[PDB]
RNA sequence: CGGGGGGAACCUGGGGAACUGAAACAUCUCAGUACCCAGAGGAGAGGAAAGAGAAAUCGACUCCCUGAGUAGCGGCGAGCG
RNA sequence: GCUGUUGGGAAGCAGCGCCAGAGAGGGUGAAAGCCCCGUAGGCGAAAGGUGGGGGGAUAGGUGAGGGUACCCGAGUACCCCGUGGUUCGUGGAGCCAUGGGGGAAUCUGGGCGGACCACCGCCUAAGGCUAAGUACUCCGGGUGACCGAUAGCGCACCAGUACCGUGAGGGAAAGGUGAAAAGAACCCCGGGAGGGGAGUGAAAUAGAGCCUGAAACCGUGGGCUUACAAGCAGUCACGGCCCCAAGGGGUUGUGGCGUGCCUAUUGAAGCAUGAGCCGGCGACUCACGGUCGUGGGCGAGCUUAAGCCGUUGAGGCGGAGGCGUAGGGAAACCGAGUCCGAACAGGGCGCGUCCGCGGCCGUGGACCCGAAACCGGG
RNA sequence: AGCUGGGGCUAGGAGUGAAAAGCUAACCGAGCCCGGAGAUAGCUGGUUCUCCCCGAAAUGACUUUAGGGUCAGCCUCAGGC
RNA sequence: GGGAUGACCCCAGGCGGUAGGGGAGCGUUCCCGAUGCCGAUGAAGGCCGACCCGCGAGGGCGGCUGGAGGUAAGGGAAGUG
RNA sequence: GACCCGGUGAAAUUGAACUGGCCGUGAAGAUGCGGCCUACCCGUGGCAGGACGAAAAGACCCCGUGGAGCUUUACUGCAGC
């Protein structure tokens, strides 16, 4: 709803910036931010556990957002923008020379 | 926004084909009683000079 | 043609006059030095002194107009047979409006300068002169109107 | 003064050797593809900018989206659009109306 | 059955100023403007001739362009029109 | 639409492609027709609004002669008094309207055509309804030789707020980290506030009213310099010391010269006005007429307005009209003449337009700021 | 002819007033707010970059004029002689 | 005056200046030029400069900052110093 | 209270100041021109001769065809009678 875009929880290839060429699963989508997730962008956040119950929370720290225009879905073949087919009854998305 | 002609002059002074400004001689509408035949006669029209440039500018539409 | 320098020729001059600087039209603004160059002044044309303009001159141009306004009366337009020389065949009002003179100006009267021409020429009147010159072949369509 | 300008504008362009009025348009069903091909044969390489006038709406759709070509109905003929362009191409029916617009 | 109250402007009607301009000022001007009241609506007003006005003329009303700063009005001033 | 290349980051640069009725525009780590949202082009409403535009269906409307003369809107017409409206200001003052008095007729009726009479003509008052073409912008949308946070609305920000006033009413200020919060764990000094390390980041003199960070203003360090000289503070000359080099830069010891700026004035260093200083805001314009000049187009002609069609930053059409081609005379009028006049005396007046630009003028505040006051409604 | 609490009424050319033109919400010879309104101001002040050429006047006439103006005089630009 | 008009060279005058008149420029915002060209090998803006061009208004160039915009020649418009 | 110490800390005013005396001069009342005399640099507690010291665009005075209050056998009107 004005929010909507390209992909959902699935395998997508990044073409981004730093993580250019990357192939990652489920993008865990926003779309408030038009952002996604993959295993692309990663950083360290500093911590001491929300409650020092199990002391430190840890230190590896997880994935940044990443603009949804950076990713590009994929199937039998590569990237491909999505196209949208009638189906004769409902409506699904098929990739250019492909399906789903 | 569009100039109006100044009726008080239109009403009392002709504009010639040169573009000179023509006015009647003043000075014989009641004065008389006995001024010479020369006086009272010598009132037909006349020119003016430098003061007509002014009088013309007010008869602006009639040219 | 090229793109630049179609450029205005010789003299366009859009350089009008601003008055603000140390050099040019300074301080008091390109004129003025005094009081009554300040946001209005009385005329002149007609005005001033508080003398009497010259509205000491006098409106002998009498016959200035009565209440219900003008009197409609048929109005006449001059045209010289000189001007007629141009065209041949037969000349009539409206035939003339579709040219330099008369136009809408109602009742045609041919008169005056130039030599006359062999053509019948409808008019509401002539000068004596122009009636005589037009003896050299040409018309007395006069009368007209109803 | 507008007639004059319009007449002259073309003339400068004629003198330049740029005015080419045509007839052939097998470049139909206004596809950019089709026009372009046709253009190639007419030596319109896209190395200079071009003003195309014609009443045929399919050739109009044909160019348009080309960025070196300015497309135009003939009643829209006008000096600015003429001048801004480097080369001038007219339908003969367009050249017919241009005739009428002067004398 | 209706009414009532509201609504940015816009409209019609009932009332209706002054600074100002006139190089003072009273007639005149600003101006039937500002403002107050009542009413109308998506508009309002107007509208089918007891009209115009000089044309064997035209043919409801409204709005635009002309006509025209003309016709005239005017302490024949300023100005109005 | 892929690859390669620099870069934190490509959309840059390079190689080789493709789409185009789509090369409007925004975004994506920078500058992308082909990544995203879009654009061209084309689809779509069960529901509730709208809807003669296209249909239907009603209401409704559909004659001649020849006779009678029964009806054709009343305190009305009409006249007078007092006023209003119209361009009309008592004018020669009609017409339209009406507070007061008097007060008809039904087509031989009655109003009008600018006092009034007479012809000639126009129209049928005293009952009512009528779309459309017109105005306006709370609201939705589209555009911009419109603004870009002292601008643009008063308000980009939780503003008609805070605040002020009994009240009517008055009325501000205040935007910006970064691509991503990755917004700085943990250690150190400290009560904290703040620092210092560590750490993130391409960048932290991007560290959180955080982009850029000018000036006034306040510091710290360094060079030259000053405690027997007198000054609008500078300047000309020499000389010394300090800094990269036969040339500069800084500073200033002694010598010569020297009455701040603006305004207003006959006259100002003036003991006449203004000004603490710095930054921003801050004043000769635009519309329509006019009149000179100038760049052009056409020329005894020139030119179109409103509109109509076309465009979707395209131009056409439209001669109603406007100036000019003829002047004189108050006019009737006459006309290259005409006016006064008895006058074949005299004498007076008697040969472009359209668009652009600039100077100036008239009307609107009309170069900007400022009254004491007057009026209306609260 | 006392003071004072609470509840009322009277207003802007109007109120109130043992009277001063006193009071009427901290300035009353006519309140305050918003509006006409950017009133008008012949007065005072202010009017912003650069270079180049020329360069005045503080007289006369009239002026409900006299520190304002209109014409003339003196400056300047263009064309012409 | 030349006149291979060269706006380039000789010859002769002049060049204090307020109100004013005239003439040439500079710079700011925006428009066409632009589907273009400059820009991360660093835009606009800022801090220096004893350097270069201009009589001047100004214009370059060089270093530092800054971090994403800017915009020729030649024209056009104005909330322009 | 004023003075010294410790804590907090305004104001009008302000062109910039490197701000002496006399005799002169000057728009005729000079730190700032001329001549001469005097004077090491910087504070603090005191005084009020000067800076025509500050404050308020003079109340006086005149000027404006500025205003407003009041008067009358000024004018012209109106309410009232």
Q: How far is CA B57 from the centre of its chain?
A: 14
Experimental determination approach used = X-ray
CA atoms within 13 A on the CB side of B5: 13
φ, ψ for residue A74, nearest 5 deg: -165, 145
User: What interhelical angle do D92-102 and D2-16 show, nearest 10?
Assistant: 140
Nucleotides of F under 7 A from a protein CB: 1-3, 8-10, 19-24, 27-29, 32, 35-37, 87-88, 91-93, 114, 180-186, 199-201, 262-264, 284-285, 287-291, 293-298, 300-301, 310-311, 314-316, 320-337, 348-351, 356-363, 365-368
Gap between the Cα atoms of C122 and C142, Å rounded: 6
Q: Is the peptide bond before A31 cis (omega within 30 degrees of 0)?
A: yes
Q: Do the two chains C and B touch, given a threshold of 8 Å on CB pairs and at least 3 pairs?
A: yes
Rounded distance, CA D62 to CA D30, Å? Answer: 4
Element (H, E) at B57: helix B51-58
Which partners does chain A have (≥3 C-beta pairs < 8 Å)?
none
Chain C residues with CB-CB distance to B6 below 8 A: 45-46
| d(CA C6, nearest CA chain D) in Å | 10
Burial class of D82 by CB neighbour count within 10 A (0 to 12, 13 to 18, 19+):
buried
What's CA B17's distance to the chain center, in Å? 15
Q: Where on the phi/psi map is residue A33: left (φ > 0), alpha (ψ -120 to 50), or beta?
A: alpha
Beta carbons within 10 angstroms of residue C42's beta carbon: 11
Nearest to C3 among D9, D13, D84 (CB): D84
- A13 — phi, psi (to 5°)? -105, 130
With b for 16 or more beta-carbon neighbours within 10 A and e for fewer, the B29-59 pattern comes to eeeeeeeeeeeeeeeeeeebeeebebbbebb
- Helix, coil or strand: residue C34: coil
Closest CA to C77 of C111, C119, C120: C111
Other beta carbons within 10 Å of D86: 16
The answer to whether residues B48 and B2 touch, using CB atoms and an 8 Å cutoff, is no
The owner of tokens 């109602």 is: C106
Query: Cα separation of C74 and C144, whole Å?
Result: 13
| Residue contact C1–D84, C-beta within 8 A | no
Closest residue (CA) to C1' of nucleotide F294 is C11
Calpha distance D61→D65 (Å, rounded): 8
By the 8 A CB rule, do A75 and A95 touch?
A: yes
- C-beta atoms of C1 and D83 within 8 A: yes
As a whole number of angstroms, the distance between CA A87 and CA B1 comes to: 71
Query: How far apart are alpha carbons C28 and C87 in whole angstroms?
Result: 64
Nearest to C85 by CA among C129, C44, C59, C118: C118
| d(C-alpha C50, C-alpha C28), whole Å | 28
């Amino acid at each position: 709803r004005v929010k909507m875009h390209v992909k959902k929880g699935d395998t997508v290839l990044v073409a981004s910036g730093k993580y250019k060429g990357r192939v990652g699963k489920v993008k865990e989508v926003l779309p408030k931010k038009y952002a996604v997730i993959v295993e692309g962008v990663n950083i360290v956040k500093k911590a001491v556990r929300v409650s020092p119950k199990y002391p430190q929370g840890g230190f590896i720290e997880k994935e940044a957002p990443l603009h949804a225009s950076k990713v590009r879905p994929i199937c039998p073949a590569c990237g491909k923008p999505t196209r949208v087919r009638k189906k004769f009854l409902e409506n699904g998305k098929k990739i250019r020379v492909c399906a789903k | 926004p569009k100039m109006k002609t100044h009726k008080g002059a239109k009403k009392r002074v002709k504009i010639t084909a040169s573009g000179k400004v023509v006015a009647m001689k003043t000075g014989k509408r009641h004065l008389n009683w006995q001024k010479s035949g020369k006086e009272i006669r010598q009132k037909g029209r006349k020119f003016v000079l430098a003061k007509p440039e002014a009088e013309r500018i007010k008869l602006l539409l009639p040219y | 043609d090229l793109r630049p320098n179609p450029g205005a020729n010789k003299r366009r001059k859009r350089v009008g006059r601003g008055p603000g600087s140390g050099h040019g039209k300074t301080a008091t603004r390109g004129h003025k030095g005094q009081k009554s160059r300040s946001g209005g002044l009385k005329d002149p044309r007609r005005f001033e002194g508080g003398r009497s303009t010259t509205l000491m001159r006098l409106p002998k141009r009498g016959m200035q107009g009565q209440v219900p306004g003008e009197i409609k009366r048929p109005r006449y337009q001059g045209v010289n047979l000189k001007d007629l020389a141009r065209f041949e065949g037969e000349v009539t009002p409206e035939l003339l409006v579709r040219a330099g003179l008369l136009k809408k100006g109602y009742r045609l009267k041919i008169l005056g300068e130039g030599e006359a021409k062999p053509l019948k020429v409808v008019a509401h009147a002539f000068s004596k002169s122009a009636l005589e010159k037009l003896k050299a072949a040409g018309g007395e369509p006069v009368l007209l109107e109803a | 003064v507008r007639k004059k300008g319009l007449a002259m504008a073309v003339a400068d362009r004629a003198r330049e050797g740029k005015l080419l009025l045509v007839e052939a348009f097998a470049g139909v069903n206004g596809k950019t593809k089709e026009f372009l091909a046709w253009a190639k044969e007419a030596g319109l390489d896209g190395s200079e900018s071009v003003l195309l006038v014609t009443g045929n709406e399919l050739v109009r759709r044909a160019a348009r989206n080309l960025p070196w070509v300015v497309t135009l109905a003939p009643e829209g003929l006008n000096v600015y659009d003429i001048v801004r362009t480097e080369r001038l191409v007219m339908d003969l029916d367009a050249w017919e109306v241009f005739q009428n617009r002067i004398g």
